[PDB]
Design a protein around this ligand. Structure first.
Ligand SMILES: [Cl-]
Ligand SMILES: [Cl-]
Ligand SMILES: [Cl-]
Ligand SMILES: [Cl-]
Ligand code: NA
Length: 129
């Protein structure tokens, strides 16, 4: 599923991401924009052989099981395929674990390089929330 900007903002809010660990909704929408272009089916292979999955590009090295990332963990206790669903519940629940991990949203390279410090409120502007 390719979400619209405000549509994703509303889904993220309903799943409790708004202000989770102090990160306003705009941060999460901005991260999803640059990680996946709002596409739940996005996948990208990393140089180390792991793969990033879904709207927030969660990596199989630590967070989900894809059966082909040797030595990796599955800290969200999910198949990586669950991160590709039109329903964002699995990605949100896993993202909540990641952002509590210690480095906050810096775990998302696209957020650090393209959202951090910017006017992230723009990403929810005009949305009926
Ligand atoms: Cl915001
Ligand atoms: Cl594996
Ligand atoms: Cl959803
Ligand atoms: Cl933080
Ligand atoms: Na894994």
């Amino acid at each position: 599923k390719v979400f619209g900007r405000c549509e994703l903002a509303a889904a993220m809010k309903r799943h409790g991401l708004d202000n989770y660990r102090g990160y306003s909704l705009g941060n999460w929408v901005c991260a999803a924009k640059f990680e996946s272009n709002f596409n739940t089916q996005a996948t990208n292979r990393n140089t180390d052989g792991s793969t990033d999955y879904g709207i927030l590009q969660i990596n199989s090295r630590w967070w989900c099981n894809d059966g082909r990332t040797p030595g990796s963990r599955n800290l969200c206790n999910i198949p990586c395929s669950a991160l590709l669903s039109s329903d964002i519940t699995a990605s949100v629940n896993c993202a909540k674990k990641i952002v509590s991990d210690g480095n906050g949203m810096n775990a998302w390279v696209a957020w650090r390089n393209r959202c951090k410090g910017t006017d992230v409120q723009a990403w929810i502007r005009g949305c009926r929330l």
